[PDB]
Amino acid sequence: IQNMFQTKSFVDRYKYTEKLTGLYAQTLVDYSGVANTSQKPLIVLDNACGIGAVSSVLNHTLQDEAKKTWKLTCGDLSEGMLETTKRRLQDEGWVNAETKIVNALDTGLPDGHYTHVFVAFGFQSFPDANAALKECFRILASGGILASSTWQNFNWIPIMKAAIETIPGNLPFPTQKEFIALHNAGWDSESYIQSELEKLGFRDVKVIPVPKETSIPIDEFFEVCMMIIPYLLPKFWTEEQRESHEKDVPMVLRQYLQDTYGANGQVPLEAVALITTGLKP
Numbered sequence: 001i002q003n004m005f006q007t008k009s010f011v012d013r014y015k016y017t018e019k020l021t022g023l024y025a026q027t028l029v030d031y032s033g034v035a036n037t038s039q040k041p042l043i044v045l046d047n048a049c050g051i052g053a054v055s056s057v058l059n060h061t062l063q064d065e066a067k068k069t070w071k072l073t074c075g076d077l078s079e080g081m082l083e084t085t086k087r088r089l090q091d092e093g094w095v096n097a098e099t100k101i102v103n104a105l106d107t108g109l110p111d112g113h114y115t116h117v118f119v120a121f122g123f124q125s126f127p128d129a130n131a132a133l134k135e136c137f138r139i140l141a142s143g144g145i146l147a148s149s150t151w152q153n154f155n156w157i158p159i160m161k162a163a164i165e166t167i168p169g170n171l172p173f174p175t176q177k178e179f180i181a182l183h184n185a186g187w188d189s190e191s192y193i194q195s196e197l198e199k200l201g202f203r204d205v206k207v208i209p210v211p212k213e214t215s216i217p218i219d220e221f222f223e224v225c226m227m228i229i230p231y232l233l234p235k236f237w238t239e240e241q242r243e244s245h246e247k248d249v250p251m252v253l254r255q256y257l258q259d260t261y262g263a264n265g266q267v268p269l270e271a272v273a274l275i276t277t278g279l280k281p
């Protein structure tokens with residue numbers, strides 16, 4: 001049995017999906033205070049780092065003096081994700097950085113080691129977010145900061161649903177709220193997040209909704225859809241529906257996007273992410 005995040009097909013399209021998660025990488029780094037903090041040296045984990053969105057921002061945002069003494073660990077469960085991150089580390093010239101297989105549910109990392117742990121769009125992807133959150137608390141030093149981003153709303157699932165509705169068969173498709181809660185519910189709620197962090201002993205917890213709007217060419221948006229739809233069909237369609245229609249999804253998506261946004265058009269991306277910070281005493 002495969003994990004979706006470890007398949008080459010998924011990793012290879014993730015650069016298009018990073019156009020969506022990357023909307024909040026600068027937000028998360030800047031809201032964490034890592035560029036202004038009194039903690040020194042910086043010991044940073046990019047947890048569930050993907051292809052390195054947060055790590056890339058950190059390397060472009062932090063002072064040279066701070067990078068002389070910091071250590072950055074880019075952690076992920078997926079060997080394929082880390083292979084891509086490692087190429088980016090080399091290409092962008094990150095300093096004092098390393099990739100490492102890190103299971104967010106059981107990191108193997110030391111108690112009280114990190115000044116900062118970033119979890120950019122990980123908690124709604126982990127099998128159990130609470131276990132991952134407890135690990136974050138364990139591995140942070142006194143005074144350490146957890147900074148996370150999670151989805152509250154976004155328009156791309158509704159766009160895909162509208163495309164799917166142009167197929168005969170009245171085919172099911174998740175709502176945004178269903179999609180974001182497939183693994184862990186609650187991470188679209190400020191009050192849930194605050195309560196969960198506080199129950200573990202985090203203090204000074206802040207949860208801020210941040211709206212973003214941009215646009216992406218239809219051909220790049222198509223790749224995002226193609227990365228996600230195949231993992232939803234076994235859950236939302238019957239076997240007969242898949243036999244009848246799965247092969248038609250690419251054409252339907254192309255046609256919907258061209259018809260709606262233009263043959264050389266741009267898809268509006270609109271989202272709200274919750275940007276959470278908490279302090280370990």
Ligand SMILES: Nc1ncnc2c1ncn2[C@@H]1O[C@H](CSCC[C@H](N)C(=O)O)[C@@H](O)[C@H]1O
Nearest residue numbers: 005021048049050053076077078103104120
């Ligand atoms: N148990 C686990 N431990 C660590 N990473 C995990 C994990 N389960 C899934 N992941 C990783 O979680 C990531 C979610 S996508 C987010 C990637 C990146 N932080 C960004 O902002 O773009 C993927 O890279 C996936 O491989």
